[PDB]
Amino acid sequence: ATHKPINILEAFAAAPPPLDYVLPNMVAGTVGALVSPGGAGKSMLALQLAAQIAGGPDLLEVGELPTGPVIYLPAEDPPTAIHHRLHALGAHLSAEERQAVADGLLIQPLIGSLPNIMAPEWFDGLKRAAEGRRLMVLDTLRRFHIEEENASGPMAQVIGRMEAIAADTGCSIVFLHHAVLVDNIRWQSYLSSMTSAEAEEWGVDDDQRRFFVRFGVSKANYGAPFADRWFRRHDGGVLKPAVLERQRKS
Amino acid sequence: ATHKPINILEAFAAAPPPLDYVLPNMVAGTVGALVSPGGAGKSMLALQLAAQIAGGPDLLEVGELPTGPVIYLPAEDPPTAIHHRLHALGAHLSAEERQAVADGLLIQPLIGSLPNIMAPEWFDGLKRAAEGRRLMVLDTLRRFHIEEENASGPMAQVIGRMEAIAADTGCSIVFLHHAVLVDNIRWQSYLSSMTSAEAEEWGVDDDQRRFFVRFGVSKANYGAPFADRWFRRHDGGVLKPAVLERQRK
Amino acid sequence: ATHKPINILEAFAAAPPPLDYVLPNMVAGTVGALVSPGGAGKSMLALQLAAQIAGGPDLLEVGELPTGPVIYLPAEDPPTAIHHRLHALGAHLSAEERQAVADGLLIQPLIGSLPNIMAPEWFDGLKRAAEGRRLMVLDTLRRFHIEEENASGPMAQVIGRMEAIAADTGCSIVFLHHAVLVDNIRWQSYLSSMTSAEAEEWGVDDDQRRFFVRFGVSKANYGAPFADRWFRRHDGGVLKPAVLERQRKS
Amino acid sequence: ATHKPINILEAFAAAPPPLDYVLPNMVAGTVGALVSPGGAGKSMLALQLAAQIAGGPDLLEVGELPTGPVIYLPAEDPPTAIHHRLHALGAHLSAEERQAVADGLLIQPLIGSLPNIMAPEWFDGLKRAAEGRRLMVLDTLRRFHIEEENASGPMAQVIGRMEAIAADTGCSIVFLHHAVLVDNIRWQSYLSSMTSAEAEEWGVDDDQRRFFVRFGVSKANYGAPFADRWFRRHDGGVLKPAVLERQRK
Amino acid sequence: ATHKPINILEAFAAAPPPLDYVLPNMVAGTVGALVSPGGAGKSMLALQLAAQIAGGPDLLEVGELPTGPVIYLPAEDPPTAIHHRLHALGAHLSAEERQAVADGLLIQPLIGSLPNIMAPEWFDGLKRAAEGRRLMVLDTLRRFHIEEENASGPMAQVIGRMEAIAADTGCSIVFLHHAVLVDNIRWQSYLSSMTSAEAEEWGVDDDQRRFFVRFGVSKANYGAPFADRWFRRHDGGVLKPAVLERQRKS
Amino acid sequence: ATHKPINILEAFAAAPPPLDYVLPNMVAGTVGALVSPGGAGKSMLALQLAAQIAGGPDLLEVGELPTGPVIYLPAEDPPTAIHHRLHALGAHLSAEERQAVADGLLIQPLIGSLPNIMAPEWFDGLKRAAEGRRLMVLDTLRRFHIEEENASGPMAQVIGRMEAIAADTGCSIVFLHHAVLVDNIRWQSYLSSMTSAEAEEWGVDDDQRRFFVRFGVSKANYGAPFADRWFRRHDGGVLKPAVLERQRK
């Protein structure tokens, strides 16, 4: 929110200091987006990412990430659904990993709460909930505001508010979005369920395509290129790397 | 609503009780949508599903569903037409089944009442009607609000309000919609009138396709897959499983 | 406008009681639409329908319809035009049919009156004019409101008002519309003038196509399917069934 | 206006007096439109029709029209240009015809006046100008209102206001329009500059087509059909029947 | 702004009096538009036209034009740019032509001034600056108002204001516009830079197309047809007739 | 600003001093735009140009530019990222060049500050920051206003405000824009990531094109033509002339 001018001479003289990535190619202290059609698994993947930064294992094999307290704000799923996802995830975690996640990760369900980042008391409240956290996840942005998502003005105000919170507190904010916003943000990732055409090409049967999703970073400023991943959906929806041959057509 | 934080150790350390589904793949206490072109059979389907959850028999053969009080709010169809739809359904029901349904279903006609969920009087009224119930059916959403249906902001408000009602009271809300409103609903089912192409697919004569409708869940969160069903429309439009053989070419 | 809960047990037990159709496949007590391009004959056909429900003959051969007092509200044609249509229609009516129509049908011209269903005094006034009538015809809806016809919110308010009047009074309301609204209504009929292509297919010369219009019900919930009709336009525009061979191309 | 109910027995029992048409197929006391791309000759056509109804001769050969006082309101063309258009027309008129036209036509220039029919002062002013007249010509509508021309709501208001004026006073209103506004006007005529295709159709050389314009009634309520006319543009743009032979291919 | 009724008998009887054209086919006392993409040379051509009506020479060879005081209001170019264009133009003018232009032409730069014709004090001020002038040039209209250029209502108000000023003062107003408005105006001219395709057709090399622009009148009511001109851009951008052979393809 | 009338005799009678360009083909004291898709290198290019006008060396080889104080306002990138971009650039600079740049460049981070040029506090603040400076860089415009970017009215206001600031203070403003806003800016430059087609054109392998970006001036008023440049992206994204041979087919 308020900054001193850069000390230029000091930025030239001080050693090349590594960018700090909250998520692959996302600079810590900023706002990013996870984008996909409803149902593709954003809520699972975000949960897994949240748990990982909280100190659980890199199950997705996206690479090791700095740890810190995390706050997950699901506003669309009822608590009981969150319990199920957690329990399913839990089967993949050791006793110590589980404990680290429980220490590091706050999940504060907001279904029916009607949170509105443009109202001063919700702004304050989201800002207080970001304080002391390294990551905040909004699942999904649509439930945190009552603006027209296709209006760039109101959306600059909505995103600007998240930017102010991330800038002041150092808590990165990632919002999920059901598939503009994209132009208003600097880091963008996505999920897409395996299509009929992608199925007939990584050599998986059509009746099995529902078990795989592509994950990538479609927008970022900085870092080494991030290769698109395939994930297999295990029980409860838990995502892990998929082992896929790929079809060099004759 | 107002939620305590999730207790994570506790969720890891023991199997939660099974998810409670109000409809196939729809978790209880949430908001879902039923969508189709006007005329495709939403009223009849919803009325049948409402009567099954109220305690009636599983005529649609969608599987056994937990029962509980249902309230059905038709805002487009006059009482006379609702009487016709109910009587036709009635002919499939024994006295006991009729009793079970009447004990569990309230139908509150709303034609001409102009309910507006963005008005505090109607918001409170709908919330009190949801209290203690398992399912509330809004037929159709177009009649419960005076906003622009392709304005995402106002629709987020309308939907937010149903979500508050569902979360405070535990009562699920299904709204029906005549084909943005769907992008941010987590459960979505549809009805689709059998087309000429599909009639040929299932060896049904063209002059007969209007007796057949397809039902499906097109969006839901992870869970047991639910197969697309064909229903036949009997008299008064009552829907029952269709007996159709697949064809090749 | 306000209703008791359905008595369910009574709806099961009471005999299958016939739907009451104000017009073919239109449930009495509701709102419906007659839709077509300007000039296709909506005003004639509506007049003929009005006269018929008032107790005149089924000249269009759409089938016999329950009788009742009718109110026709033309807001677009001057009185003298209405006189001409009436006089022309009159030539097709017996002395007793004429008298029945005059007893049953009120025509209250509204050209230049500026009626607005969203203003409380016009609402009240339309409601009072529906009272005691079985059918009210608005010719055309565009003259009864100052909303954007392509805005679904304002149009839900405009149609909702007609629904409130039809529900309270039992007077069905049919509005004409010059070619949304269609999604906001449950019964929809149309007129379309015979095209060049339809002419070369029911075997009528091109210079004669102007004498025929297709009438159908493009939307309804209930009843036996209503077959599209051709009508011939006689003197003054009066519509009657047309006798058309139809062209099985070789 | 305020109308007595139609007396139905009386309308059945005797032949009404003939419809009174202010223009071919346009009933007197209503609102109609004349439409064309800017430049196609609306001003000249309307001025000629206004001068014929005022009492001038039938140069357009559209048939004899009832006469009565006309008021013509050009809001886009400066007086100098109107003087030019009138003088050119004048050369077709005898002294007697010039007199008849001046007795029956008032032309009130409005360029720069910014008349707004939605403002009470201008609504009253136009209504008083219509009083006792047979025709009022608004050239063009774009200059009599400050609304969006493809906003149906505001345009219904603008048009409603002309309809009130026409019904209270008996004076017909024709507005001209440079090509929603047309969907809800009951009489619509047009002008169309002869195209290359049409030039070939009527054996006119391409370098000459700009001397020819087509006139027609594209919408009207039931009545005697009115054939599309070709006009030739003489000096100053005066329009007169064109002498053109149809061609085949 | 306010007019007496036409004396009809006098318009018939008084001799055929020549229309007074401020610019080719533009009736004096009205509003017109010069339209083109940014960068095509509107500001030069308008300057040249302004200087010509002020009493400088017909360098563009558009035909001789009545003289009168002119006011040029550039709101987009800084003074120093105007000085350069002037100096370059000056090289084409005799000592007497220069003096006539300086006597006749006021240039009042408005860059950064924020003029708004919808504000009463700017309206008054533009009206006062039109008084005593034969031509006023607004370069470009976009800087004289804060309305939506694609909204026909607000644009009727903006143009209506210019029409009121031109009608009262007899000062014609021409606004430039960077490429609706066109339907709201009766005289329209344009500039278009020579395209790749026009280059390969008037037989000028591609690397030379940047030296030519087409000028025409795309909309007018009155006068002899105005032939499209090619202009060559000389030093400083000064426009003069181009000598172009034209390519009758085999 | 407030301008005296142009003295025309004086402008004709003597050669004005040369135009003063702040950037190639952009007259000093005006507003210009730099446009590209997000990611294409605007921040780096602008930072390099800002450092050159501040007194640094001409690494881009766009020609010698007059120097003067520059203020750079990044509103999207966190300080950490700006430190990285500056350090990378720093590696191309001698101690003296580092000094010259630090003497002439102020960088005021704005992430999360939500500057709004339509608010009087921010309008005044930006104007005082422009005072006495030669260049002000707004990175990007989207963060300096809360209007709709394809609403011409509000954008005319936003741009009008920059033009007032530039004219009152003499400080040029360049805003960057992630690809109406461009139709009414008089100077426009762009960056374009090398495409597959272009890679083939300049014999660069596809897996290498992401190291190359094209820079150009796509709109400016009459003046010396400025050729499109290819830049190579070195570490941290520093841009320098690319050494590329044209290919034929």
UniProtKB/Swiss-Prot annotation, chains B, D, F:
SUPFAM superfamilies: P-loop containing nucleoside triphosphate hydrolases. GO terms for molecular function: ATP binding. Keywords: ATP-binding, Nucleotide-binding, Plasmid, Plasmid copy control. InterPro entries: P-loop_NTPase, RepA. Signal peptide: none annotated. Pfam families: AAA_25. One of its GO terms (biological process) is plasmid maintenance. This protein is involved in regulating the plasmid copy-number. Increasing the level of this protein results in a higher plasmid copy-number. This is Regulatory protein RepA. It comes from Escherichia coli. The gene is repA.
